[PDB]
Amino acid sequence: GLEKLTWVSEKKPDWSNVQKLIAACEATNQYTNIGPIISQLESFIRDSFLIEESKAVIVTSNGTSALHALVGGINRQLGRELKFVTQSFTFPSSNQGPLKDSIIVDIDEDGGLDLNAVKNIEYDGIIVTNIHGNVVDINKYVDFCMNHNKLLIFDNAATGYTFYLGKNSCNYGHASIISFHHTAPFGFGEGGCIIVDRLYENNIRIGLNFGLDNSLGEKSQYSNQASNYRMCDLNAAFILSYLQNNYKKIINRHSEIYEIYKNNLPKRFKLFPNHSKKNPVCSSICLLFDKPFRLDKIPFLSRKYYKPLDLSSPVSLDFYQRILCIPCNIDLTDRQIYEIIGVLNEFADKN
Amino acid sequence: GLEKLTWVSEKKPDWSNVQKLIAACEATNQYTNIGPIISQLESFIRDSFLIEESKAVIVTSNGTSALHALVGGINRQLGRELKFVTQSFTFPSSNQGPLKDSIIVDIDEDGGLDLNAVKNIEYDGIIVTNIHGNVVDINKYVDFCMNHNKLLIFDNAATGYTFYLGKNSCNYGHASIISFHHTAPFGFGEGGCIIVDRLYENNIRIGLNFGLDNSLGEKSQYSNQASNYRMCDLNAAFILSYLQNNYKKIINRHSEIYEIYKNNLPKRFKLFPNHSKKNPVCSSICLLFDKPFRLDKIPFLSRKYYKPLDLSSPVSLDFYQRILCIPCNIDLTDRQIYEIIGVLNEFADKN
Ligand SMILES: Cc1ncc(COP(=O)(O)O)c(/C=N/[C@H]2[C@H](O)[C@@H](O)[C@@H](OP(=O)(O)OP(=O)(O)OC[C@H]3O[C@@H](n4cc(C)c(=O)[nH]c4=O)C[C@@H]3O)O[C@@H]2C)c1O
Ligand SMILES: Cc1ncc(COP(=O)(O)O)c(/C=N/[C@H]2[C@H](O)[C@@H](O)[C@@H](OP(=O)(O)OP(=O)(O)OC[C@H]3O[C@@H](n4cc(C)c(=O)[nH]c4=O)C[C@@H]3O)O[C@@H]2C)c1O
Ligand SMILES: [Cl-]
Ligand SMILES: [Cl-]
Ligand SMILES: [Cl-]
Ligand SMILES: [Cl-]
Ligand code: NA
Ligand code: NA
């Protein structure tokens, strides 16, 4: 039964839909450098994920490039290489590229960057990871960055449709990023998106194109803070088509999977910390066992995220050692979920 | 007849062929993190472009990420952020990402980084741009870097199939990069490739995946010098298909178009400096006028590359003021070439 578990739902192109979209590229020979699909996908993300008009929606090559293009654009606007703090319990993206020298501090027990740990640090902003669709106490972080006059970026790579006080979590802070990597619920191949205050929109958009702005003609000027961060229209067509066919079913079905775990917790596990009133839409079901344990004890497909970036982050290491990330996708039957919960109950009695 | 000039030939997916290649992805749900297409495109590039076995062929998301992945891999291998010199007369890529603090020096009149400008300064390596399919005197750079114990990278973004003393220019220096951007002769959408000494292959390839090596399980370690730099298998399929169908015709027709300009040079125009014995395979036909002039004087689709990264570099600036980059692609007719040449004679008579 559980032998057939996969991390990601089986994802195949709607070839007729993808070919219809790319027929726009074929007619003009424009397949990149902001061809005719980019605005269709940015529009679809705004209207489907419910991004406020105060935010630009900016697609990039991947979730990593979304975060990097966001920072390089803000670096260009403020005129220096900004110093960000990130949490140890997250993916490498937030200590790479323009963040390669980001400061790493521990999480608190709610899964986000420990605000008590930056007391005595020099920094311009913080990056907080909303883990696998779960969200932190977002207003704790908004209030803190308002009071201390800091930039706030939410790493929502795995968190495209978790609502906080009646609005997509992507709408909070100065910006968020989401991943359309194949392993993400909304993903297909590679891609990313920046949700950012309009203040920074132009510098981030031209920052996808080496900092060059064709609208300036001979005044067009590259920035050493920019790169090739743009989304290819080919990738936009595959992502847009996947979202068109699947995004509603993913939200409802992922919410249904979360409901079953919430009402049938195996003994001595807890749900990863989450601060949304409705079920989050998760990239995996993350449970914390009450004691450290090794994945090879679990006789079904399962993972640990995230290996701490700084292995001297004690709260981050504890979570890593105690966490069990279970597949969450639209291919999973309830029968499989109940068979999973029974294997975990067994494990809990013998460990 | 010059109304219908395009920079790039009309490029259209061979959909039955692309569908056939991506069927391997559909069968396993693996569309990135090195799916079943990556090895196929890497092999084709090795066998078709005639790369030697002492070189890795490593595809990436774009030409920029090929350069940045190359530098990040080497930085991580040597345990230090290496200092590169780049030429002013190049694209912004070689002053971005891990090269954002690269030293910019002038070209000499042969079109490459002026070695006299790095006699008395600190640096680990040089990046030399082979402009639009033209190649520098490659052995003077190989000899200099061997004598001074310096790394040598060729920015071959626009230069996939120009031969130097019997082998693809990509096989010289410690590494080269090529672009599969839609604007490149070999390109389709977005893509890049690294041709590099085997010594650096493993650090560069894991460096496309945040520095992570799955084969090491728990000792898998991210690097602050890495990123998401991989090519998605979707992109690999479009590029591999375009190359299967067109690469031979592009090589022959681009060489024939060059032959016509070389035997019918317009008045007071010289070919861009080139050191290949056979006609180079050009991304555009670059001519130097005998004095500065404006593009708005040329009554057909034409460009100037490259706006100097450092506007104070005198040879780079002189080149930019005198250069005319004429479309070179497999849609161009001989009729159109002789018309362009007639227009440039008329331009010379009046300027
Ligand atoms: C908080 C955060 N911020 C930023 C980012 C950066 O976003 P991107 O630049 O990646 O868009 C991430 C990435 N988060 C993602 C990564 O994107 C992904 O590589 C995977 O990191 P790995 O676990 O190292 O990948 P891999 O082991 O290859 O795949 C996991 C499972 O998915 C399966 N899979 C994978 C791919 C690529 C596929 O095409 N099909 C498929 O079935 C295989 C396996 O069972 O998951 C992370 C959580 C992130 O979690
Ligand atoms: C020396 C060197 N190193 C590194 C790189 C970096 O490689 P990538 O990361 O780009 O793969 C480049 C790129 N060199 C290329 C760039 O790839 C391209 O953006 C274009 O830089 P722009 O001139 O700023 O782009 P754009 O004006 O949009 O395109 C030029 C012409 O191509 C036409 N076009 C363009 C696209 C994107 C398309 O899809 N279809 C099409 O017909 C329109 C126009 O007439 O040309 C450069 C020489 C380079 O020349
Ligand atoms: Cl809420
Ligand atoms: Cl679909
Ligand atoms: Cl084709
Ligand atoms: Cl030769
Ligand atoms: Na927008
Ligand atoms: Na706001």
Curated annotation (Swiss-Prot), chains A, B:
Top-level taxon: Viruses
GO BP, one annotated term: polysaccharide biosynthetic process
InterPro entries (alphabetical): DegT/StrS_aminotransferase, PyrdxlP-dep_Trfase, PyrdxlP-dep_Trfase_major
SUPFAM superfamilies referenced in this protein's UniProt entry, alphabetically: PLP-dependent transferases
GO MF, one annotated term: pyridoxal phosphate binding
Stated name of the protein: Uncharacterized protein L136
The organism of origin for this protein: Acanthamoeba polyphaga mimivirus
